Amino acid sequence: SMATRIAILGAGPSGMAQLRAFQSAQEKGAEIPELVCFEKQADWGGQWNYTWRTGLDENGEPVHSSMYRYLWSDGPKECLEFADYTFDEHFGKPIASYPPREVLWDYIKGRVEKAGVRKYIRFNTAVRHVEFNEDSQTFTVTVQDHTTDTIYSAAFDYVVCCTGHFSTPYVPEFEGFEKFGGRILHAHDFRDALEFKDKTVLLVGSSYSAEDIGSQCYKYGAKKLISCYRTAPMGYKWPENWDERPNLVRVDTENAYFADGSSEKVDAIILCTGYIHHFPFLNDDLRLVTNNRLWPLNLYKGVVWEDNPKFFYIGMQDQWYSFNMFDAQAWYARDVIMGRLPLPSKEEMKADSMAWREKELTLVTAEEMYTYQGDYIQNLIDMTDYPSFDIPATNKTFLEWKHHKKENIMTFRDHSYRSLMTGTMAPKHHTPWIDALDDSLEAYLSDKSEIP
Amino acid sequence: MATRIAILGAGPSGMAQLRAFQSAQEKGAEIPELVCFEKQADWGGQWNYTWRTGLDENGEPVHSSMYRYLWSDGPKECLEFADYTFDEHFGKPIASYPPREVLWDYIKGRVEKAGVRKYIRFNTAVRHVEFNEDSQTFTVTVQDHTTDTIYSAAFDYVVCCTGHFSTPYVPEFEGFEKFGGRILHAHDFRDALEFKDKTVLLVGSSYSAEDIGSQCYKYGAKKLISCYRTAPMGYKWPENWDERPNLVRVDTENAYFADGSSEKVDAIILCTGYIHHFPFLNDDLRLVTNNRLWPLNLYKGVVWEDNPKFFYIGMQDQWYSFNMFDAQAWYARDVIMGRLPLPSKEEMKADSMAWREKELTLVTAEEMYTYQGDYIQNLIDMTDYPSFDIPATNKTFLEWKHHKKENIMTFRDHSYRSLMTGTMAPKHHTPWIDALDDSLEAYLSDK
Ligand SMILES: Cc1cc2nc3c(=O)[nH]c(=O)nc-3n(C[C@H](O)[C@H](O)[C@H](O)COP(=O)(O)OP(=O)(O)OC[C@H]3O[C@@H](n4cnc5c(N)ncnc54)[C@H](O)[C@@H]3O)c2cc1C
Ligand SMILES: Cc1cc2nc3c(=O)[nH]c(=O)nc-3n(C[C@H](O)[C@H](O)[C@H](O)COP(=O)(O)OP(=O)(O)OC[C@H]3O[C@@H](n4cnc5c(N)ncnc54)[C@H](O)[C@@H]3O)c2cc1C
Ligand SMILES: NC(=O)c1ccc[n+]([C@@H]2O[C@H](COP(=O)([O-])OP(=O)(O)OC[C@H]3O[C@@H](n4cnc5c(N)ncnc54)[C@H](OP(=O)(O)O)[C@@H]3O)[C@@H](O)[C@H]2O)c1
Numbered sequence: 094s095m096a097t098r099i100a101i102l103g104a105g106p107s108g109m110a111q112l113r114a115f116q117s118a119q120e121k122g123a124e125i126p127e128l129v130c131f132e133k134q135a136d137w138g139g140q141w142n143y144t145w146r147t148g149l150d151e152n153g154e155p156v157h158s159s160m161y162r163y164l165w166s167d168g169p170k171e172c173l174e175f176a177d178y179t180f181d182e183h184f185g186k187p188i189a190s191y192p193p194r195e196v197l198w199d200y201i202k203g204r205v206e207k208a209g210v211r212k213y214i215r216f217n218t219a220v221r222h223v224e225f226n227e228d229s230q231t232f233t234v235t236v237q238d239h240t241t242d243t244i245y246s247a248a249f250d251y252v253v254c255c256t257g258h259f260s261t262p263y264v265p266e267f268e269g270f271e272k273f274g275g276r277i278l279h280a281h282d283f284r285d286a287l288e289f290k291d292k293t294v295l296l297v298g299s300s301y302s303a304e305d306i307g308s309q310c311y312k313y314g315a316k317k318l319i320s321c322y323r324t325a326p327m328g329y330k331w332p333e334n335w336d337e338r339p340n341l342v343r344v345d346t347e348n349a350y351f352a353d354g355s356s357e358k359v360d361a362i363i364l365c366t367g368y369i370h371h372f373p374f375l376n377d378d379l380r381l382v383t384n385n386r387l388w389p390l391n392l393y394k395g396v397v398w399e400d401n402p403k404f405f406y407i408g409m410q411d412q413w414y415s416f417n418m419f420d421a422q423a424w425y426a427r428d429v430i431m432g433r434l435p436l437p438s439k440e441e442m443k444a445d446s447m448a449w450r451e452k453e454l455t456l457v458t459a460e461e462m463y464t465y466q467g468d469y470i471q472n473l474i475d476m477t478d479y480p481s482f483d484i485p486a487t488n489k490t491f492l493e494w495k496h497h498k499k500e501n502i503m504t505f506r507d508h509s510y511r512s513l514m515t516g517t518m519a520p521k522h523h524t525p526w527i528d529a530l531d532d533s534l535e536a537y538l539s540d541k542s543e544i545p
Numbered sequence: 546m547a548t549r550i551a552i553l554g555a556g557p558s559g560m561a562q563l564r565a566f567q568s569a570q571e572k573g574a575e576i577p578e579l580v581c582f583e584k585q586a587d588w589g590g591q592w593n594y595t596w597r598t599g600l601d602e603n604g605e606p607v608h609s610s611m612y613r614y615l616w617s618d619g620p621k622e623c624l625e626f627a628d629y630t631f632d633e634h635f636g637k638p639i640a641s642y643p644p645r646e647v648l649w650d651y652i653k654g655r656v657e658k659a660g661v662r663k664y665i666r667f668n669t670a671v672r673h674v675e676f677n678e679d680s681q682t683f684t685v686t687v688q689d690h691t692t693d694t695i696y697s698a699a700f701d702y703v704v705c706c707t708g709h710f711s712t713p714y715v716p717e718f719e720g721f722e723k724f725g726g727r728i729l730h731a732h733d734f735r736d737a738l739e740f741k742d743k744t745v746l747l748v749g750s751s752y753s754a755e756d757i758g759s760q761c762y763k764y765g766a767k768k769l770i771s772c773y774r775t776a777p778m779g780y781k782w783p784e785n786w787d788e789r790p791n792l793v794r795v796d797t798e799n800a801y802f803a804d805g806s807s808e809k810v811d812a813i814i815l816c817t818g819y820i821h822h823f824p825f826l827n828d829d830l831r832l833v834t835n836n837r838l839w840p841l842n843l844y845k846g847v848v849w850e851d852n853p854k855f856f857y858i859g860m861q862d863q864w865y866s867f868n869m870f871d872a873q874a875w876y877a878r879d880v881i882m883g884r885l886p887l888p889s890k891e892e893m894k895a896d897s898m899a900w901r902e903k904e905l906t907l908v909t910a911e912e913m914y915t916y917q918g919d920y921i922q923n924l925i926d927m928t929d930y931p932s933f934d935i936p937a938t939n940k941t942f943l944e945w946k947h948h949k950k951e952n953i954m955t956f957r958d959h960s961y962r963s964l965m966t967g968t969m970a971p972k973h974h975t976p977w978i979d980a981l982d983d984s985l986e987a988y989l990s991d992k
């Protein structure tokens with residue numbers, strides 16, 4: 094019961110971490126501020142809360158999750174496993190290294206359920222506007238409760254933005270899109286790969302989305318796949334029915350034309366072109382503007398807003414590390430809010446951020462990048478009671494996974510790694526990835542193999 | 546004039562509001578400063594077509610619900626402008642059901658001739674509108690996506706023209722998370738070619754279902770099924786189209802109906818309507834209603850009763866469209882300019898109740914068109930807007946309704962007489978079923 098009141102925006106993994114950071118301080122006998130957390134969806138989990146919905150949701154709010162059917166962990170589970178809450182504790186047994194979305198979801202929910210932080214969240218409530226008043230030094234937050242269809246506002250001493258940056262699509266235009274007769278969609282709207290069975294699918298872009306959405310279409314029966322790249326080819330060894338081309342230049346009624354002078358009939362086009370940082374509830378004095386990168390400017394320690402240090406952002410960096418980074422950020426943000434870590438002058442903040450940015454521009458290899466984020470996280474955890482974990486060993490595990498992708502892009506999900514928390518090696522899954530058609534938690538956790 | 550006005554939206558309603566003020570000025574009156582905000586890159590609202598779906602290039606919800614191959618759903622004659630005629634714009638008579646691009650050209654010509662483009666800030670999204678009791682002004686906050694800046698400005702009056710067919714009502718059905726085909730709302734429908742040789746389920750029984758179904762048919766869908774929550778559409782469909790009772794659930798590949806039937810379905814299109822959504826407004830300003838001929842809380846259907854300095858255009862269900870917006874917009878300027886003083890709050894409320902009472906009386910389509918006819922007539926008699934022949938327009942609606950009944954696939958092949966020029970519309974060079982090309986250039990030639 095501290096005099097202050099805190100608003101957390103979002104109950105995805107970052108917002109969960111911020112609640113769980115406060116709860117942990119309290120469990121250790123400290124006095125915490127009042128917490129309110131606003132979430133526009135009906136349940137928590139952010140990206141992990143899968144929906145069939147597309148575009149706008151039931152209340153007219155933009156659909157948040159970019160996740161599709163059949164999604165599994167893109168990296169080794171070992172690399173995101175929680176320091177305070179372990180896979181063996183949650184599941185009671187060892188499982189393979191690349192669990193499907195439902196299975197990861199269950200695990201991340203288990204940690205917040207055990208913490209009892211659900212009671213701070215208002216669900217089905219969308220944040221409309223946030224304003225800072227110079228007179229009272231307080232934030233006014235306006236939200237819409239879709240359960241009662243009411244709009245109200247409330248006053249807060251600090252605000253922590255945890256609204257994510259993989260939800261609002263970057264969707265470039267190509268010549269002839271208004272004439273093309275097949276479906277055009279962004280990766281954000283992709284749901285079931287079965288919709289593209291026996292079709293030719295063009296994937297525009299050359300990053301994680303293209304890799305994975307491609308692979309799903311392949312696995313579930315697409316006739317043929319083409320992917321095209323703006324600047325450099327992905328360079329993996331694709332299956333027989335998948336080619337990689339230079340950029341799309343235009344499209345016609347039925348066909349796509351490429352910079353190499355090739356052309357062919359295409360059934361559907363999927364833009365795998367990324368996301369923008371979008372904060373519609375924030376005016377300029379509070380609003381972060383950046384491209385997706387390891388070190389956004391204007392965030393002291395990557396979390397405190399330099400123009401108004403009572404506002405914080407969690408998770409706004411590109412994510413090589415995910416969950417552990419959110420915890421380190423969230424722990425750091427509580428300690429500054431609670432007064433345990435006093436902020437330096439604005440000048441010092443800006444000099445610190447510039448050094449981080451300078452170093453970021455140096456980075457060339459994937460290895461250097463994991464290390465950089467690793468060092469970032471380490472610098473945060475050393476400032477709080479958050480427990481150190483083995484970053485160098487995690488980095489090494491990332492490297493193995495990168496190498497496995499190089500070897501065979503379709504089979505990397507069949508490998509196993511050793512837990513950094515428990516030293517235990519992950520078992521082989523009961524069905525190989527290519528044949529594991531069912532993505533349900535029940536099928537994963539059983540022990541019946543699936544038929545080819 | 547000392548005052549400043551914000552018009553939100555540059556579709557047909559916001560174009561009408563601009564064009565209203567310009568007319569007053571053209572006749573020598575001193576008008577207020579106008580600023581109009583439009584989130585899209587060009588005007589025309591629904592009629593500005595986009596391949597885009599869900600969210601646009603700036604992260605704003607995609608506004609237009611219009612699809613390839615869309616044509617006027619009613620006779621052009623029934624929406625022809627009183628002050629700007631078809632013959633004037635096109636130079637010649639043209640058929641009665643023009644494709645989207647052609648109608649769009651027509652409505653743009655009126656505003657281009659008016660020169661009102663200079664009032665509009667394009668690519669600018671409205672984020673928040675607030676009323677300040679102290680200064681008796683509105684603060685409007687917007688995001689200019691060309692410069693990625695957010696700013697605000699003070700206004701004496703605000704006119705909301707943001708439409709009500711853009712935010713989908715999308716109900717959930719059991720099994721949607723397991724169904725392997727595409728599921729979309731009518732709002733996201735674009736090219737019917739996407740469904741060639743496929744079985745498409747259309748949920749709902751109104752205009753969207755009729756027309757989205759018709760396009761799929763016309764462009765080669767293997768089979769169509771449409772299901773209705775309460776009553777069948779009742780038209781005589783082609784051989785490959787059934788009408789069934791409501792969907793109850795769906796599985797991996799199949800849809801199950803309340804009649805106990807079931808079949809394999811490739812794609813599901815929810816034609817289930819829209820909601821009135823105003824994310825930039827708090828409760829003191831925000832209209833809440835279902836789609837209907839007479840929403841409550843709007844005096845004369847346009848003046849917000851809780852704050853009479855705020856107005857809404859086009860929020861009614863639309864039997865009449867463009868003519869109705871003009872009448873509202875003319876009525877709104879005259880009150881803004883002080884030419885029509887407002888009655889007390891009690892009187893406003895008694896007037897709206899009488900309108901609502903009458904609305905609840907209505908049973909037949911004919912009574913409805915007439916009710917909106919009467920509403921419009923009451924509006925135009927208060928201002929210099931030119932009367933036009935409402936009872937003749939009503940009669941024309943009635944012909945069109947009858948033509949739909951006879952044959953749902955061919956109603957677009959008929960012609961009607963202009964209420965402004967008395968001229969009969971010519972038969973189009975190609976019959977609807979065969980008129981695959983929807984371009985303006987193809988429509989205006991004669992092959
Ligand atoms: C397709 C895809 C696959 C991914 N796969 C992996 C993976 O395998 N492993 C991994 O570690 N990471 C993965 N990620 C990264 C993912 O970003 C993180 O795991 C995590 O979800 C980020 O958490 P967050 O809470 O910061 O953002 P989010 O999960 O996006 O949560 C943001 C929350 O804020 C809410 N919100 C937004 N605006 C408002 C508002 N106006 N009012 C109220 N609430 C609002 C949203 O509803 C949501 O709940 C993936 C991301 C994507 C997009
Ligand atoms: C699929 C479909 C077919 C139709 N067919 C016909 C027909 O055949 N004949 C007929 O008479 N009528 C038809 N209509 C009716 C249509 O509503 C009207 O013709 C007309 O478009 C309504 O005009 P409006 O200006 O009120 O709304 P809209 O055309 O919807 O214009 C709203 C405008 O406001 C803007 N806006 C919304 N929010 C913001 C914001 N926050 N900031 C800035 N700008 C914003 C939008 O970008 C848009 O330009 C059809 C409607 C639909 C959906
Ligand atoms: N687990 C991890 O280690 C890890 C690490 C980082 C990110 N991620 C994932 O990154 C994901 C987002 O993936 P993403 O692929 O959607 O975003 P992204 O990584 O930013 O990729 C954007 C992609 O679209 C391409 N592109 C943009 N504009 C284009 C155009 N006009 N024409 C052609 N191509 C264009 C870019 O090409 P260019 O390359 O030429 O710019 C790039 O390939 C999230 O799921 C997150 O999990 C995961």
Ligand SMILES: NC(=O)c1ccc[n+]([C@@H]2O[C@H](COP(=O)([O-])OP(=O)(O)OC[C@H]3O[C@@H](n4cnc5c(N)ncnc54)[C@H](OP(=O)(O)O)[C@@H]3O)[C@@H](O)[C@H]2O)c1
Pocket residue numbers: 618619710716731748749750751752753754772773774775776791816817818819836862863864865
């Ligand atoms: N030119 C004209 O004369 C005219 C006049 C009026 C409107 N319009 C048009 O109205 C159009 C809006 O089209 P619309 O069809 O989308 O809006 P709508 O007319 O409100 O259609 C809503 C439809 O969805 C159905 N529905 C809602 N929930 C359902 C559920 N759970 N299950 C099954 N069906 C459900 C309704 O069934 P129920 O009927 O049982 O409620 C109804 O058929 C605009 O295009 C506008 O032009 C045109």
